[PDB]
C-alpha cells in the first residue's frame, strides 16, 4: 500500500530518515458538503505545486536530495555533522532551523540559481 | 495520427507520439460537474507527475532507469515487444507486475541513486 511506512522514520535520525524520502512524498498528493471536499482536494494540489515550484526556483526540480552552492552559516546552526545526522531527528532539526528557513530559502534563490542559470546561459554560449 | 491514433500501432511506432497524448491530459447542474471534471483531471495528471518525480523521470516522456528487467515479468524479446505488440496488449501483459516495478523504480533509483550522487558530488 502507498500508505505503508508513512512517517515511520519520523523518530529516526536525520541520516536514517533520509533513506525514506519517497515514502513521505508519495502520500502528499493523494452542496457545501461537496464544496468542502473540492476545497480539500484543491488545497492538496496547491500545496504540492507550491513545494514543487520552490524546488524549481532553487534548481532542485525532480530531486529528493539536492546539493546547492549556498554555504552553511554557523549563525543558523553551529552543530557538527555527527550531532545533526547521527544524533538528531528531522522534527528536532526543523524546530531548531525554522527561524532561519526563510533566510536559507532566500539565499537558495538569490545566491545561486539565479546566478547559476545566468552563467550556464553563458557557458553553453561559447 | 492525432490523440490515441497510435493505439493500434506497435509499441515502437507508438513511442514517437507520446506528446500527442500528453497534450490532452490537462485539456447548478453542469456547473458542479464542470468543476469536478477540472479538479479530477488535475489530480490524475499530478499523480502521474508525482510518480515520474519519485522515479527521477521528472520533465521526461522517455526515461531510462537503473532497474534491470526481470524475466518473470515478461520473457519476450525486443522484437516481440516493440515491433510486434501494441501498448494495450503490453499493459494487459504487465498488470500483476506494475506495482513491483514501481516499487523498484522508487527504491533502486532516485533514492539510492540520489544518495550516491550526494556522495559523488562530495569530492
Amino acid at each position, epitope marked *: *500500500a502507498v500508505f*505503508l*511506512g508513512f512517517l*515511520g*522514520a519520523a523518530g*529516526s535520525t536525520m541520516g*536514517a530518515a533520509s*533513506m*525514506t524520502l*519517497t*515514502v513521505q512524498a508519495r502520500n502528499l498528493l493523494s452542496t457545501v458538503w461537496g464544496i468542502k471536499q473540492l476545497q480539500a482536494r484543491v488545497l492538496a494540489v496547491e500545496r504540492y505545486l507550491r513545494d514543487q515550484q520552490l524546488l524549481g526556483i532553487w534548481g532542485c526540480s525532480g530531486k529528493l536530495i539536492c546539493c546547492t552552492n549556498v554555504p552553511w552559516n554557523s549563525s543558523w546552526s553551529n552543530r557538527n555533522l555527527s550531532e545533526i545526522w547521527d544524533n538528531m531527528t528531522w522534527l528536532q532539526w526543523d524546530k531548531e532551523i525554522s527561524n532561519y528557513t526563510q533566510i536559507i530559502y532566500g539565499l537558495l534563490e538569490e545566491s545561486q540559481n539565479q546566478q547559476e542559470k545566468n552563467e550556464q546561459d553563458l557557458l553553453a554560449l561559447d | 495520427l492525432g490523440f490515441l491514433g497510435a493505439a493500434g500501432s506497435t509499441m515502437g511506432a507508438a513511442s514517437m507520439t507520446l506528446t500527442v497524448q500528453a497534450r490532452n491530459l490537462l485539456s447548478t447542474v453542469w456547473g458542479i460537474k464542470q468543476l469536478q471534471a477540472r479538479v479530477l483531471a488535475v489530480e490524475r495528471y499530478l499523480r502521474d507527475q508525482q510518480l515520474l518525480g519519485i522515479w527521477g523521470c521528472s520533465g521526461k516522456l522517455i526515461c531510462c532507469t537503473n532497474v534491470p528487467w526481470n524475466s518473470s515479468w515478461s520473457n519476450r524479446n525486443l522484437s516481440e515487444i516493440w515491433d510486434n505488440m501494441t501498448w494495450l496488449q503490453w499493459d494487459k501483459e504487465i498488470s500483476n507486475y506494475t*506495482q513491483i516495478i514501481y*516499487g*523498484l523504480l*522508487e*527504491e533502486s533509483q532516485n533514492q539510492q541513486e540520489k544518495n550516491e550522487q550526494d556522495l559523488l558530488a562530495l569530492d
Partner: nanobody
Amino acid sequence: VQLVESGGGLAKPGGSLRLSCAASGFTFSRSIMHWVRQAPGKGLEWVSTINYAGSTYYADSVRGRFVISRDNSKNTLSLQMNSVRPEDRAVYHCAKDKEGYYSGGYPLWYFDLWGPGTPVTIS
C-alpha cells in the same frame, strides 16, 4: 533457509543475558529481523525488531532494557537483555519478515521464517 538460536539460559532477577541467532539460507543484509518470545502461560509475544538499515523498534515492556542488534558480516542477529526480570521467562525465537512492497524499511511484522527458539529462565 533456517534460523538457529544460541545463548539464553538462566539469569538472576537483575542480571543480563545475551541471545544469538544465526541465519543460513537467505541474504542477511536486506531482511528485517525480530525477536519474539513465548512464555509458558501467555503465548507468543513480539519483543523487538531491527531493519536492514539498523533502525530498531521495541515493545513497551522491554524498551530501555533490551538492545537488538545485527552483524551482517556473520549473518548473526543478537539481543542484549539487560535488567532481566521474572516476567521475561520465555522461549525466544528470531524471525524474518516477509518481503513486501517498499516501505522505506518499515517492518510488516508477518513472520516469514522462524527459528526453533532458545529458552530463557529468570531466577
